[PDB]
Write a protein that binds this DNA or RNA. Sequence first.
RNA 1: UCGGAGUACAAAAAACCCUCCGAGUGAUUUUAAUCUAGACAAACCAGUCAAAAUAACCAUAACAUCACUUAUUGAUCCAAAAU
Lengths: 143, 48, 95, 92, 52, 354, 110
Amino acid sequence: PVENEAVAPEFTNRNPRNLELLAVARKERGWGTVWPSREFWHRLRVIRTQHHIEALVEHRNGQVVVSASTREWAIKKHLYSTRNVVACESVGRVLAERCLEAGINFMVYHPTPWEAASDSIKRLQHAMTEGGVVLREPRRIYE
Amino acid sequence: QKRQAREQLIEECMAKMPQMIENWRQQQQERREKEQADKDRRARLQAE
Amino acid sequence: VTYFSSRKGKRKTVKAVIYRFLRLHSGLWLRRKAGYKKKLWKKTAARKRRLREFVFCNKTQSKLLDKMTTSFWKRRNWYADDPYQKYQDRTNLKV
Amino acid sequence: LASADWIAEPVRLKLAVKHKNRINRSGELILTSECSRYQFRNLADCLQKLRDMIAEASQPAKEPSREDAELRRSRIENMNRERLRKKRISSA
Amino acid sequence: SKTILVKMMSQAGTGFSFNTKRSRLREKLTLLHYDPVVKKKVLFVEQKKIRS
Amino acid sequence: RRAAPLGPMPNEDIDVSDLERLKKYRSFDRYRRRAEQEARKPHWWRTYREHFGEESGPKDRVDIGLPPPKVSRTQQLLERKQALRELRANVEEERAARLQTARIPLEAVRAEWERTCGPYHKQRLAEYCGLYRDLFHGATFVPRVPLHVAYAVGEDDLMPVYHGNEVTPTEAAQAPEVTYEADEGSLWTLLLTNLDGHLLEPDAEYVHWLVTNIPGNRVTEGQETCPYLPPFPARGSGFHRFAFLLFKQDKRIDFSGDTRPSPCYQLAQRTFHTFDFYKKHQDAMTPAGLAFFQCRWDDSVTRVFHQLLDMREPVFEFVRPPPYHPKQKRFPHRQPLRYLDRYRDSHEPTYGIY
Amino acid sequence: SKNLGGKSPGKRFGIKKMEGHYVHAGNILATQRHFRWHPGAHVGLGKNKCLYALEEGVVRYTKEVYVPNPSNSEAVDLVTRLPQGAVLYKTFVHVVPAKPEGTFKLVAML
RNA sequence: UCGGAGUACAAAAAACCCUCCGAGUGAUUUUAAUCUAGACAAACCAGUCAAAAUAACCAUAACAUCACUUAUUGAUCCAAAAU
Ligand SMILES: [Mg+2]
Ligand SMILES: [Mg+2]
Ligand SMILES: [Mg+2]
Ligand SMILES: [Mg+2]
Ligand SMILES: [Mg+2]
């Protein structure tokens, strides 16, 4: 027969993002008694220090995937007062384009109740939404 | 005939359902507003 | 239980067992959970569902009910549109 | 599908467009039945699927309604992909 | 502080009644419940009084 | 019985007595920062990371790549402080900042990011996507030189291929254009490798486009060892990875064992191992560029399978393990009537002798 | 006499699955009256503080930091009253999944 | 009769006409569904949890909450409602 016709029916996909992108990967349900919830694939974390603002996307294992910080020279040289709301929206838009480049479209954001009412982080969420990255990571198929 | 009568009555009662819901909500809101106004005026007259 | 009747000399059966129990031909006995119609306003939805569900009997109760009933109630019945005809038999029992 | 002359040309075209996922490389449309233990019922299911496809391609009032539970993710992904594709530079 | 048991019938047309506890010193009760027959939020009103 | 602690206790440093004079935090987010800092330390007790695969914790990754560029720290700091001062001296920037109406040169920011710190983010994204683990299994490299890859999907429509992007096979049917800054004194090689999608060997990978002895930037002028083949991911298994590896070489590498014929439509011949390739030609080439994208099945993959590869399109599906059920009991006590349905082979009535 | 009602059966509030035990989905790992063991990865919490496995795997017990829900007023007050260097620790029960999510099997060549 | 603490110091169980607290329910609205894996406990009867899937609300929760929340409860048969 055809030399290429061999199939090896046990197909193995070694891509670590394969099931995450197919939305059939095993989300880490669980803790329930601590905060924030760890049921996700990629989580957005915003650290607002007294001098700089940094925004990360992290995997379930805690590894840093894509990060944008006002400590970076690229944003520092184009930005003034790296702590303020314009700095927050700047880093939000930069992280949005970086996530789009990296292939991440869905994240989860779990801020504190006082942080959700802040003026800067609402603008960061709006900047992500207008940049194309959407929160509310999709539900797992056959959860 | 029994099945058709049941379905017709169900449709008739479901057609007006949002109207009854809104009327009940308005009645409850008026009740709570009247209670709040009575309490506020009682407190105001007691203060003086 | 009347092991030897005074008229025919046969073995009698108690009617309470057949009135409140059902026997599948595989030997299992099916019953309703006690208290499934009592004070439903006082019970949680999960508890009400658990009471509504049908349940089986263990070996001791099954043997007791077999002793109380006669051989007419252990026969194979082919009813018209029987709800439990699919459950009359046991499959894939590895003992 | 090409040699099936018992249905019209537009119907054949519609089956070719829609059910190309289940069309063999030789052009043979293939229908699968696995539900019942009886080959009679299996063939009945195959014929019912064939009749349903024929009727769906024959009716002109097909609005092509699409589901939304699993299509929002695809829409978002296409949105974000053409957000990068929108670069306009001549090439080739 | 004695309560009362009242049977409420659905106003969605279909016959569906559920029993709930209410205070005696309250007016005729009217709430929003779920009717399995129509699978929608339906206004329920107190129809009968059963238990004290 | 009691056992002595096998190391320092967590809260044994601060003094229990005289809590009033001891400083306290009043901020939940501050406590959160402290707790997340503590949770990452290698404690001597059983932790979540140890059981859930910290990947052997720290690993001394072997670096096979170009040295980082040498810059003057003092001069760089002086220029950066000067730029910050000259920016802060402005008053229109202050007014824009206070009025919250100020925009950002996103293209510029991306340019300096890719110039100064892009390689490290790209390397960590390659680590997260598992490129190094499947290409060398023991080595990591930093993509020092940017590599811009783009497909042409029309007359004015260009699809960029960043790190981890998703590209349709229809968009990737044609060969792409690759650009990277390089002087006219060096030689480069470019390799497009399909990591996942080999039907037979799980540990092997496919070749798609191998060009060698590239003079500087003109890739079209350099000879192509392997003709371009469009991506052909299977219908069932989706989201395969395709990696563009760029190697900078000193000598003019010439080989005959890695050369492919003109058609090159045989999957047996298009079987590759990047580890073996780099072991064979490790002395000259050094990896300096990386560009990988995800790719799923579309309507053109069947055409690629049929016309080009001359085979039947394979179809897979994501099957799940059958539900677990305990051993069936002779007398299932207090079990629902549906207990017998959990061990039924088929929902059909079998009459054994009737 | 004067003391009445002291008789009541034990509620069997305890641990059901120890470390290393292979559990399936839905198995009750441990039941409790107050929060003694906290759920972690792939361990869900019932309404009666019981802990049940959500995935089939191996049960593990760990000591981990405790960051409470910011809406929990009592725990937030405790945290804000904690001293500078103090971090809370709790015993969490985890289920480490064993079987993969699924497999890619060939069905037909079209 | 039911629950909590000690007896019963660390998985479970464990008695006395042993030592002390309690319950035979209130307040409020979020009026809290169906179906089903797998489990706890248990002589039996009873009691408890619960993933996935379904129709309505954010298109991101629904386990009703509080009073130490744990106890606030009664089997068949038989009688009544409108089934
Ligand atoms: Mg410096
Ligand atoms: Mg006791
Ligand atoms: Mg006792
Ligand atoms: Mg047991
Ligand atoms: Mg659910």
